[PDB]
Design a protein around this ligand. Sequence first.
Ligand code: FEC
Ligand code: FEC
Ligand code: FEC
Ligand code: FEC
Ligand code: FEC
Lengths: 230, 230, 230, 230, 230
Amino acid sequence: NFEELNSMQRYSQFAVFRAIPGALGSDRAEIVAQAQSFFDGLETAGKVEVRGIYDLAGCRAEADFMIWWIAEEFEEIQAAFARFRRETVLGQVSEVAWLGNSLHRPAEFNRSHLPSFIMGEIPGDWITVYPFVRSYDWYIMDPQKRRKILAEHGQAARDFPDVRANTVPAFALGDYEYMLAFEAPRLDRIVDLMHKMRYTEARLHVREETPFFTGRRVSEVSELVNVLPG
Amino acid sequence: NFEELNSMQRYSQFAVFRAIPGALGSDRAEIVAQAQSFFDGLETAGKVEVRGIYDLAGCRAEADFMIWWIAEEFEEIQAAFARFRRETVLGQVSEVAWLGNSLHRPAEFNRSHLPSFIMGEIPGDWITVYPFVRSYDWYIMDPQKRRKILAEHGQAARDFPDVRANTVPAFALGDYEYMLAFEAPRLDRIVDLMHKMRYTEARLHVREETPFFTGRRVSEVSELVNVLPG
Amino acid sequence: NFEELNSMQRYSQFAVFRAIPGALGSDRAEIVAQAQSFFDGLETAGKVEVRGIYDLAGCRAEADFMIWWIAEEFEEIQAAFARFRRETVLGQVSEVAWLGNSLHRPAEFNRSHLPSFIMGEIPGDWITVYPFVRSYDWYIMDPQKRRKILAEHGQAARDFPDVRANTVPAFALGDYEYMLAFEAPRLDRIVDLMHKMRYTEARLHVREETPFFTGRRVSEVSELVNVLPG
Amino acid sequence: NFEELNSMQRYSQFAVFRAIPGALGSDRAEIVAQAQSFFDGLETAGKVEVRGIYDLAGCRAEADFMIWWIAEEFEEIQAAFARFRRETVLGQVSEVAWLGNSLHRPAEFNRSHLPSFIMGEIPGDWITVYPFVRSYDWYIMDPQKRRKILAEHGQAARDFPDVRANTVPAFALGDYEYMLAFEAPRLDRIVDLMHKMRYTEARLHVREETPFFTGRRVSEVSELVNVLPG
Amino acid sequence: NFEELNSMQRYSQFAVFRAIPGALGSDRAEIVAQAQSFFDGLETAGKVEVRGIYDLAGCRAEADFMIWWIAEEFEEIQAAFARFRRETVLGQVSEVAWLGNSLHRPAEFNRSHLPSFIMGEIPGDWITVYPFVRSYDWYIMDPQKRRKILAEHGQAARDFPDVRANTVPAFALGDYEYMLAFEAPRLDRIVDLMHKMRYTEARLHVREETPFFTGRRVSEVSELVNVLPG
Ligand code: FEC
Ligand code: FEC
Ligand code: FEC
Ligand code: FEC
Ligand code: FEC
């Protein structure tokens, strides 16, 4: 099944939204009821798996919450994404802020490196996601040297096994090359990990890694809706 | 044929639009029939060729659908684009997000390399479109050096003959040097072509290649109007 | 007369406007008349010369049409510019998208390179306008090296005598160094010229050259107002 | 006690807000009371410490005031932030401009350097806040060279002991690597510190340090509320 | 007195506003009366010196007029800037586009160089304003090499004594290092000065110098308010 985990087809999308001030109002029970119904429908249809919903309040301006859903076919995420904005009031009073799309593929050298979500691990309580673009010369570099740099890079994170990684290619799914998501039970551990990873030779082959989206996984839509601005 | 295909004048435009939340309303039957009537007119007139309409739902924020159409004269694309915005409710309740214009020309060295749309090939079910800007030294470079880089570049895509390429100059038709479009029966094949094309010396002569637009070709206007947000 | 031309004082402005969807409507005859009446008063006063009005439909998002007008003193352009927005409906229902200002000066080495509008040449049916910023090391370069670079640059355009050039300084009149406009009877002639001009050593001393505005010169106001979105 | 401060966990957020014209109005006695009462709540709950509220009028377009508050847990900053926008009129008539989050950590080589707020010092009357991002080769630089570079960096600031420094890591809490705040009783001593600090080898390892936020600490909510635009 | 001129403390701000179409209207007589009254109160108060009001119509999109005022303390500019926005109808129907703040300081090597406003010279009828940022290596450069580079810089400007300079530090007051303003009786003399300064070695140590704001000093508020779009 290790071969099946590498040959698996899974599209992953991070859908970031911002709240429109003055749109939600103070009465939100129907919005909550209609929204939880939509997600109940996704779950029983068995096609789009919602890994988490995250309260992004306080991370950045122009972003409030985010959905992380996965599916075998991208056209499934298109329809769920479209139906959310079209047939739910929460989707009609939310603006789309940023979309991070990716597709699982095996690693170039160490095929034991698999995304946390590919392996069915339990999602972390805290998350940070952001895109990634490598240097222009990265992929044509001597494969022996690139393999050496990626080994020092994996070895530099040995002290953070509580932080689960998700590196997923994103070519042609947007303006980026990879899509990154890191889950942990505590935010301060993610911060510490990013700091340590700066001490690697791979940092000399980086072109872009913004924007960042950092938030807490909520247990149910009501926990998130009731927080948003009015 | 290959000389007349190289010599023919064809302009090509990718018209990307963004839905205005709240403008479409829930009753769209008349809006669909009117839009279909507009496209049927273009066909019978036989001046502007619509290669495809694409649902971009979930690709990026601030974009929803796209029109790809072609004409021998550019002012006929101007008139169809302006008429679409002016005389159809769909175009009235849509916002222009981005325009990618190009004009067909023969390749520098290999004159058997022609866009898939120039060769009359059936359009693919999935598409990614993005503009392109080479490095400043690309064209003044030793011509035989460029020749060699483009040949290796071409060989790196030998295993993706199901992905059909459209590389069209765009000088002075916008902010870009080339308009790129790649169509295929499956989206995953485009992601993997882009990933493979990173292993080329030509990646050292790239200045810009965003924004990306990726979507699914719809069989009819109605299929698209229905997924858009109200 | 030749040194008389190099000594002239002329300011040139490209005023690009963007239509406000929903602000115009379908009864545009009076709007067209007040607009025509305004441009008649300018020519009557004989201080501001309108070289052409241009339909940019389909060129880029957030731009619809452009005015090119010239005057000996810049304050006369400010007046015509502010009166157009203040005292004509077409100006009250349009947004300023971009302004490109310049002031004619003689060339550094070749005093017989003069802008087309300074030579009084008939304006072209198709135009492309964009700003220009040279590399930081351009002007402190050896004058003889820079002189040779400009001479080879000029020679690369020998085969496009139907494309007339306006290369005008713009220092301190905005964010750029030069303002460029290229007039031709056919758009493809402008595209082919720019592609050819890439094969010059002058491309290694370039810092900026966007945004581009390309369009067709209209015979009369009505021709433009009837294309815009209602 | 320095060992206990280094090991302290403290989250810090700068919440920059911009006023909405025509939203606040002329009568504000009730907004200042509801607002003053909100901050009174945080005081009792003893979870979120407001280090200062700053009047940013005149610093930059699209920013008017700022809140600097600290919490042991970032979830507490999330709730406080979300409650302000949701449960006070001041937060409902303002929009979020920019957010600067950080987490206090011990320094690399000199463990006696601690943020001025970790030291419990008194907030300066004037402040400048801005993010920071080092060069890509900074942390993988030979540690002795970095130690020395930061030593010179420290000696170069001996002239300004009256400006208190807060340098806090910000990895994964946004688009930046560090969050910087500099507190002083006079604004001009901050300006001179930035000017003097330009003369350091550290400046050769900088990638980004904008946007800046500079303003005056207010002694109570009323005075800030009353300078804002109606 | 020159030593007092180098030791004098003076804050300078360029406050750029943007008219709101539809917000001014036609009957602007009480508007101008109220704005002239506010500026007259400023002169009587004697703390904030208005150096000029500038008509920026036609320079750039999204900018219409500019105020240049000076004060010994920056708190007094905050007060007038806020009071203008909050209490004068003009400030209420204008948007803040950009703010340029600086603080007068002595020159590094030649203390005879002083801004034109610090010496009390009559303001010029035309102006160009823009921020400036030097290269990262500029201040750590060998002082004698920077002394020589600045001396040649100054000598390049000798052909333009009619163009008066105001180069003022802007560290910590925004996103820039210097705030530049050049006043002259003719606009074409400002363009020719910029063009000539390009022939200097200091140009190899530049990072940012945009945006520009170029306009005409008006005699009285009335002269400007009548130009604005309704
Ligand atoms: C964080 C973070 C970034 C982005 C920040 C940065 O650039 O430092 C980051 C960047 C990337 C990027 C691109 C890739 C894509 C590969 C490439 O071709 O560039 C990429 C891919 C890989 N990462 Fe990665 N990462 N990464 C971790 C976290 C981060 N990683 C942690 C933790 C571990 C260690 C734990 C684990 O293996 O599960 C780890 C290891 C790997 C391995 C396997 C290592 C091995 O071969 O031994 C592969 C493959
Ligand atoms: C994808 C993709 C990109 C953008 C990504 C990248 O930059 O790597 C991409 C980039 C460019 C760019 C610019 C140009 C413009 C020419 C230049 O001066 O740069 C450009 C133009 C050409 N491409 Fe290109 N491409 N490209 C393919 C797909 C992609 N291509 C595939 C597939 C094939 C192979 C199959 C085909 O012939 O159709 C292929 C080959 C060519 C040939 C013919 C080479 C030959 O002599 O063999 C020419 C000419
Ligand atoms: C197109 C185009 C650009 C921008 C695109 C590019 O960078 O390739 C372009 C860029 C620039 C720029 C800056 C300048 C300003 C000079 C400098 O100091 O940078 C600038 C100025 C000059 N151009 Fe220029 N151009 N340019 C033509 C078209 C383009 N030109 C064509 C055509 C001809 C030849 C036809 C004619 O003169 O009628 C031509 C010749 C000149 C001459 C005369 C040289 C001579 O022959 O000795 C001068 C001076
Ligand atoms: C202002 C300013 C900047 C941003 C501008 C710049 O780039 O110059 C600035 C930049 C940074 C940055 C990143 C860091 C993060 C460390 C690193 O890995 O880069 C960073 C961190 C440190 N700074 Fe820093 N600064 N800084 C001061 C003010 C500024 N500082 C003043 C004042 C003093 C001296 C007074 C004091 O706080 O005790 C001072 C000293 C330190 C020390 C302790 C020095 C020592 O070991 O000798 C550390 C650690
Ligand atoms: C215009 C213009 C720019 C921006 C364009 C450019 O980058 O070339 C411009 C750029 C800068 C910049 C930064 C600084 C800040 C100092 C530094 O470290 O960069 C800066 C500061 C100085 N400027 Fe400057 N300028 N500048 C003039 C106009 C311009 N200047 C004119 C005119 C004169 C001629 C003096 C006169 O008024 O009598 C002149 C001379 C000086 C002197 C005096 C040097 C001396 O000792 O001889 C100092 C100090």
